[PDB]
Design a protein around this motif. Structure first.
Motif, PDB file in Angstrom:
ATOM      1  N   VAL A   1       0.870  -1.166   0.000  1.00  0.00           N
ATOM      2  CA  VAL A   1       0.000   0.000   0.000  1.00  0.00           C
ATOM      3  C   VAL A   1       0.909   1.218   0.000  1.00  0.00           C
ATOM      4  O   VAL A   1       1.658   1.444   0.957  1.00  0.00           O
ATOM      5  N   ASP A   2       0.863   1.992  -1.076  1.00  0.00           N
ATOM      6  CA  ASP A   2       1.697   3.172  -1.232  1.00  0.00           C
ATOM      7  C   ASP A   2       0.869   4.409  -0.930  1.00  0.00           C
ATOM      8  O   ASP A   2      -0.243   4.555  -1.445  1.00  0.00           O
ATOM      9  N   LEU A   3       1.406   5.291  -0.095  1.00  0.00           N
ATOM     10  CA  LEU A   3       0.779   6.588   0.107  1.00  0.00           C
ATOM     11  C   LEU A   3       0.933   7.424  -1.155  1.00  0.00           C
ATOM     12  O   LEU A   3       2.033   7.549  -1.699  1.00  0.00           O
ATOM     13  N   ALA A   4      -0.173   7.999  -1.623  1.00  0.00           N
ATOM     14  CA  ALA A   4      -0.149   8.787  -2.846  1.00  0.00           C
ATOM     15  C   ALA A   4       0.405  10.187  -2.638  1.00  0.00           C
ATOM     16  O   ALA A   4       0.567  10.922  -3.617  1.00  0.00           O
ATOM     17  N   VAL A   5       0.696  10.571  -1.401  1.00  0.00           N
ATOM     18  CA  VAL A   5       1.181  11.911  -1.090  1.00  0.00           C
ATOM     19  C   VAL A   5       2.654  11.819  -0.711  1.00  0.00           C
ATOM     20  O   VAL A   5       3.103  10.766  -0.240  1.00  0.00           O
ATOM     21  N   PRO A   6       3.439  12.877  -0.900  1.00  0.00           N
ATOM     22  CA  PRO A   6       4.877  12.785  -0.634  1.00  0.00           C
ATOM     23  C   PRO A   6       5.185  12.660   0.851  1.00  0.00           C
ATOM     24  O   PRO A   6       4.356  12.938   1.719  1.00  0.00           O
ATOM     25  N   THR A   7       6.418  12.226   1.124  1.00  0.00           N
ATOM     26  CA  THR A   7       6.871  12.014   2.496  1.00  0.00           C
ATOM     27  C   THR A   7       6.777  13.282   3.333  1.00  0.00           C
ATOM     28  O   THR A   7       6.474  13.213   4.529  1.00  0.00           O
ATOM     29  N   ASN A   8       7.017  14.447   2.731  1.00  0.00           N
ATOM     30  CA  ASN A   8       6.960  15.693   3.485  1.00  0.00           C
ATOM     31  C   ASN A   8       5.554  16.040   3.949  1.00  0.00           C
ATOM     32  O   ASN A   8       5.401  16.949   4.773  1.00  0.00           O
ATOM     33  N   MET A   9       4.529  15.347   3.450  1.00  0.00           N
ATOM     34  CA  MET A   9       3.147  15.596   3.844  1.00  0.00           C
ATOM     35  C   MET A   9       2.633  14.545   4.823  1.00  0.00           C
ATOM     36  O   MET A   9       2.158  14.884   5.910  1.00  0.00           O
ATOM     37  N   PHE A  10       2.716  13.268   4.454  1.00  0.00           N
ATOM     38  CA  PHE A  10       2.263  12.173   5.300  1.00  0.00           C
ATOM     39  C   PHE A  10       3.290  11.053   5.267  1.00  0.00           C
ATOM     40  O   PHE A  10       3.948  10.827   4.250  1.00  0.00           O
ATOM     41  N   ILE A  11       3.418  10.347   6.388  1.00  0.00           N
ATOM     42  CA  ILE A  11       4.286   9.179   6.485  1.00  0.00           C
ATOM     43  C   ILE A  11       3.572   8.100   7.282  1.00  0.00           C
ATOM     44  O   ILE A  11       2.915   8.387   8.288  1.00  0.00           O
ATOM     45  N   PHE A  12       3.699   6.856   6.832  1.00  0.00           N
ATOM     46  CA  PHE A  12       3.245   5.719   7.623  1.00  0.00           C
ATOM     47  C   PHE A  12       4.144   5.591   8.845  1.00  0.00           C
ATOM     48  O   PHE A  12       5.324   5.250   8.722  1.00  0.00           O
TER      49      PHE A  12
END
Lengths: 299, 103, 161
Positions: A269-280
Motif C-alpha cells: 500500500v503506497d501513500l499517494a502523497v509525498p513524504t513531506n506531507m504524510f508518512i506511515f
C-alpha cells in the motif's frame, strides 16, 4: 481537553517579546541526497529567523539559503569570521509567509561518502548557539503528518500462476490526526463526521484539504471496496476503514520448484502523497493478519 | 484611471510613455535599456556566495525613483507616486525550483 | 525563429512484465510505465499565488486536463489497444518554468496483427508497443527517448517469453 480553531469577533500586545524557540536537525548528505529543503511556519510579521549549519565529522561546509514558498530568494548565506559553521538571519515584512531553508553542496559535488551536518534553526531567538531549553519550545519546521496503517487478510481468494497474480480479500485501516479536519460539535450536534462509499481522494476533493490517499501498488483492474467509511472527530482524529477484494500483480512468482515452491504474496500500500506531507508511522494490529479459516486451503 | 495591457516574450523590457498584477505566466514584475547587464548579472549570480540577495540593490538600483517591485500579490496596494521635478517590467532575477537554486 | 515551431516532447516507455499472450485472437497484455516530458510555457504560473513549485493533476488523462485547462497538450493513445487500458499512478506535474511531465503505470492489451505462429514452437515474435501522439506533427513531436529505467526489466523465476 482544550480546543483550537479560527474565529471572528464582533490586538493589544503579549509581554514585550514574542515566543522564541529553536530546534536541531542532523542532515545526512550522501550520493543519493546532495540537496535538502525544510519548510517552516507562518512567521507572523516582525518575527526573526536564524539558521546555522556546522559540520561534525568533517569540514565540507555545505551552502545554505532561505527562500519563500515558491522558491523566490529571501536570504543568502555568509560564512562567519571564525572557522566552520555558517550564520543566516532574516526578518519578514509580510504576514503568513512560509520559509524554506535549503542546504546544498552545489560547489562541493565531489563524492567520497556519507556526511553528517548539525543544523540549528530558530525563530524569534537571537541566540548565537543552542544554549539551553532547546526542546521546551515548539518545533520550527513543518512536520509530516503521522498516520498509522493496519492491514489484515481474511482469505486468499485465488492465485493465477500463468499471469502471475493473486486475488486477496481483507481489511485496511488508516488513522491520522489532522486538526484542520476538526469541527465544533455545536453546529452539527454530533461527535463524529462520516463519509461513506467514497475513497480518500474523493473526500479530499470535496473538502479541498490534504488527506493521506493511498493505492495498492500492484493492483490489477478495479478494486472491490465495501464498508468504505471515514470518521472524523472534533479533535482532528480521522480514521478510514475499507474491506477490499483486490487482484494484485505478483512479478516475483518463482514456480521453478513446483509443487515444492514457496511463494511470497506481497501486498504493498503506497501513500499517494509525498513524504513531506504524510508518512506511515506505525502498524496497527487491530486484528490477526492471516486470520482463521474452516477447512483446508490450497495455500 | 489609466490601464495598459502588458506582455513580453522574455521580459527583456518595454518602456512606457510619461509625457499591478500578472494575468498569467511565471513572470515576476518590478531612459536607456541595459542589454549586456542581463548577461553580467546572469554570470555573476552563478557561483556566488552571500551576494545573490545583494546584486539587486547593488546594480539594479540605477533605475531609481521607480522602484515598486511587486514580486507577487502580497503587496496588493496602489502607489500615488511623486514627481520631484518637471519632466522594464519583469526581468527580476528570482528562483522557482525548490530542489536546486537556478536563477 | 519566425516560424511557429512544433513543441518538443521526450517519451520513455518501460515494460515491467509481459502479462500474457493470446495466440488465437493474436493479442498480448503487457504492464509497464510511460513517461512524457515537454516544455510549454503557456502552462506556466506564478508560484506567488499557489505558494508551491509544482501543480499536480491526478487520476486524469492528458485529454481530460487539456479539456479542463483549454490549452493544447500532447495527448497520446496506444495504437493497437483493445478494451480499456488500466492506468494507475497517473499524474501530471507542471512547473512555473513551463516544464510538464506525465507519468502512468499501465496494464494494456495490445492487438498484434503480426503474429506468425507458423514455426511454433520455434517461432520468434515481435511485440510492438506503439504510442501515437493524438495531436498533429505541427503541434507536438516526439523528439527523443528517455531511458529513465531499463526497458525489459528484471524478473525472478523463469518466463514463457
Amino acid at each position: 481537553t482544550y480546543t483550537t480553531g479560527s474565529f471572528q469577533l464582533i490586538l493589544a500586545s503579549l509581554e514585550i517579546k514574542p515566543e522564541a524557540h529553536v530546534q536541531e536537525l542532523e542532515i545526512r548528505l550522501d550520493k543519493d541526497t546532495r540537496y535538502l529543503t525544510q519548510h517552516t511556519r507562518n512567521l507572523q510579521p516582525g518575527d526573526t529567523f536564524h539558521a546555522l549549519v556546522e559540520p561534525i565529522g568533517e569540514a565540507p561546509l555545505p551552502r545554505l539559503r532561505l527562500t519563500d514558498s515558491g522558491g523566490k530568494p529571501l536570504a543568502f548565506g555568509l560564512i562567519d569570521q571564525p572557522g566552520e559553521s555558517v550564520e543566516l538571519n532574516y526578518t519578514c515584512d509580510q504576514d503568513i509567509c512560509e520559509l524554506v531553508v535549503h542546504v546544498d553542496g552545489t560547489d562541493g559535488q565531489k563524492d567520497s561518502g556519507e556526511a553528517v551536518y548539525r543544523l540549528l534553526v530558530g525563530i524569534n531567538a537571537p541566540n548565537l548557539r543552542e544554549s539551553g531549553q532547546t526542546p521546551v519550545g515548539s518545533s520550527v519546521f513543518l512536520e509530516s503528518d503521522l498516520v498509522t496503517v493496519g492491514l489484515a487478510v481474511d482469505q486468499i481468494v485465488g492465485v493465477d500462476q500463468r499471469s502471475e497474480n493473486f486475488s486477496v480479500v481483507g481489511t485496511l485501516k488508516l488513522s491520522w490526526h489532522d486538526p484542520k479536519l476538526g469541527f465544533s460539535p455545536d453546529q452539527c450536534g454530533c461527535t463524529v463526521k462520516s463519509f461513506e462509499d467514497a475513497s480518500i481522494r474523493a473526500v479530499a476533493g470535496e473538502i479541498n484539504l490534504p488527506l493521506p490517499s493511498f493505492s495498492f501498488y500492484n493492483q490489477q483492474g478495479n478494486r472491490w471496496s465495501q464498508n468504505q467509511v471515514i470518521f472524523v472527530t472534533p479533535d482532528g482524529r480521522a480514521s478510514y476503514f475499507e474491506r477490499f477484494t483486490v487482484t494484485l500483480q505478483a512479478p516475483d512468482f518463482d514456480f521453478l520448484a513446483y509443487p515444492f515452491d514457496r511463494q511470497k504474496f506481497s501486498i504493498k500500500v503506497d501513500l499517494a502523497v509525498p513524504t513531506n506531507m504524510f508518512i506511515f508511522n506505525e502498524i496497527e494490529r487491530f486484528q490477526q493478519v492471516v486470520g482463521d479459516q474452516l477447512g483446508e486451503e490450497e495455500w | 484611471v489609466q490601464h495598459f495591457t502588458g506582455y513580453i516574450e522574455d521580459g527583456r523590457g518595454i518602456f512606457y510613455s510619461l509625457p499591478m498584477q500578472n494575468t498569467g505566466g511565471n513572470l515576476d514584475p518590478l531612459e536607456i535599456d541595459p542589454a549586456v547587464s542581463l548577461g553580467q548579472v546572469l554570470e555573476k549570480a552563478l557561483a556566488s556566495e552571500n551576494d545573490l540577495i545583494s546584486e539587486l540593490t547593488a546594480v539594479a538600483d540605477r533605475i531609481f525613483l521607480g522602484w515598486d517591485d511587486d514580486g507577487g500579490k502580497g503587496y496588493s496596494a496602489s502607489l500615488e507616486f511623486t514627481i520631484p521635478r518637471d519632466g522594464f517590467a519583469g526581468s527580476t532575477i528570482t528562483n522557482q525550483r525548490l530542489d536546486k537554486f537556478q536563477p
